[PDB]
Design a protein around this ligand. Sequence first.
Ligand SMILES: [NH3+]C[C@H](O)c1ccc(O)c(O)c1
Lengths: 270, 197, 75
Amino acid sequence: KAILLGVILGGLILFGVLGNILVILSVACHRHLHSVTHYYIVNLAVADLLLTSTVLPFSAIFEVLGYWAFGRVFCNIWAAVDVLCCTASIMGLCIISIDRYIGVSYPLRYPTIVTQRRGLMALLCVWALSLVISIGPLFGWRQPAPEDETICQINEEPGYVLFSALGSFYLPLAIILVMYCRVYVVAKRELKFSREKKAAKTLGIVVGCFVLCWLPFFLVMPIGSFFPDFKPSETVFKIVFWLGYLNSCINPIIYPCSSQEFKKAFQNVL
Amino acid sequence: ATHRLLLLGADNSGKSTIVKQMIFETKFQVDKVNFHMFDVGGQRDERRKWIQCFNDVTAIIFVVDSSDYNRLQEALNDFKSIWNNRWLRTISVILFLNKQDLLAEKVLAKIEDYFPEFARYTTPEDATPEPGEDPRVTRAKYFIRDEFLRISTASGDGRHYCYPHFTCAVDTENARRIFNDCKDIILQMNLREYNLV
Amino acid sequence: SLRLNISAHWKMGWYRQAPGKEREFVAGIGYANTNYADSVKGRFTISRDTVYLQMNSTAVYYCAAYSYYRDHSYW
Ligand SMILES: [NH3+]C[C@H](O)c1ccc(O)c(O)c1
């Protein structure tokens, strides 16, 4: 039962990395794909690529073998790059949501409220806040860990995980839900069944996949690191730990197919 | 942020007067949004920019004098021309039924003479005139608006809209009309782009 | 010379706390592997069921038990 989980993890890894290299390759030639929302889509694509190309095979090997066969500096690199890539893609979704809200409620003053003077400052702010959360307990809140070159602990130190969970999921979840609430309000013409159901289907997936992926993990981890009366098993922990990796393979499917020119550029591969 | 409007209009139809509300390009602004309106002449002597201004536009402002019934079928022919054209067939059209104050004097004197099937049409529901309006004048105005919408509804595509308005000669609230219609055109394109409609 | 919580996938190791030195890795056995150190590669083997070492031929030791991925410990 080792090679079977290995081949399904390799299939998911290969599908995710192929989707993200197709999303990042479909923009690198077309000069028409040079707006700010295309920047905000390729930022999510490069965060999912940086996760899926490096962090995912090591976690798959760690699940097949059952022990981290590499060193200890590799584990401290791997956990930090894991947290960095996951919260960078979450805040990439947050700024995509903000861009679409100020794209559908100020349609004429949009290029005077979004400029590259400040459309590449929110990008650096979310990347810097991601690097603050990731390289937080590299000196700050790390509990003393055993000195094996075989285990590789996650950073479940309480006090840090609550700050990280709050300011890495629950504030971007609030921002995404209220801005997509405004987008759904404006997109109801504001005979009407085809106007309401066409929006409640294409925003339902872009909030449902994100909530269904990240809310199990970000709900299990702080409730288990603060209330140790729940005590989740290893199987449910690996399931909620791998849904967050599944989100970065889901995101190639949704977000270019939630546009017009991205879907044409992606369908141009075949 | 520029927005290249395209003013076709008709000759001696209040077009040059409705320009003065700040072939010759003009510019104006509303809420610090800068529209740049391209005049063309009236689609009778200058079809030169029809290749050049075919794609960069965001709307097409077609203004027509409404009082003179003798010069009415040529306007409907030009609207059927531009509404079902080739290069400018995916651009939404703003429609300005100018000189309604002249129509209020030109009615009380008949619209059924120049166009025979006026009495077959009546004043419909969901219509709201201004305060103190004669029903025959509103019936004639909505009759020619319904004629322009009958020409407008002859494509079956839903790829480009049409926004009609009843403007007088010296109305000051007409730049906000083009502002709101350009906002609605760009918002429909934004909702089509994000796969929301 | 001297020989010297309960889970399933939890690893169980033995460390040596020397005078003034830091906690150096000495031995460990788990459900997935069994790792040793260079200092006790031949002079001390391990035994698991309780978990204890078995040395043959630097005086204080610590028997520990921990996880592979979650940040737990039992010293
Ligand atoms: N798989 C998710 C990734 O391991 C992650 C993301 C955010 C965290 O706060 C974390 O501890 C771990």
